[PDB]
């Protein structure tokens, strides 16, 4: 029932390929949501043209 969000910023030389070096993720905070999650989706910020 605890959800943790991890943020790591690593400079990447390759345009898309992930870096060989290990990246250590750090959780900002621990939140007791108490509800199991089985689906996730990303959010897009889009502006009118």
């Amino acid at each position: 029932g605890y959800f943790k969000i991890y943020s790591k910023h690593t400079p990447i030389n390759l345009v898309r390929d992930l870096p060989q070096g290990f990246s250590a993720l750090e959780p900002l905070v621990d939140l007791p949501i108490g509800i199991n999650i089985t689906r996730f989706q990303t959010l897009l910020a889009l502006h009118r043209s």
Partner: protein, 50 residues
């Protein structure tokens, strides 16, 4: 501390827990250090010398 009772000398901590982390327990499972509840300052736990 937070309903957990231990007997040891209390000293300030050079080490710093991450914000999510509140306590540190060693390999024996004894608490290595306790972060103060009222203010977020890490306190090292050293058992009284025997």
């Amino acid at each position: 501390f937070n309903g957990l009772t231990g007997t040891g000398v209390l000293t300030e901590s050079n080490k710093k827990f991450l914000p999510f982390q509140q306590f540190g327990r060693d390999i024996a499972d004894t608490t290595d250090a306790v972060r103060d509840p009222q203010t977020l300052e890490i306190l090292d736990i050293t058992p009284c010398s025997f």
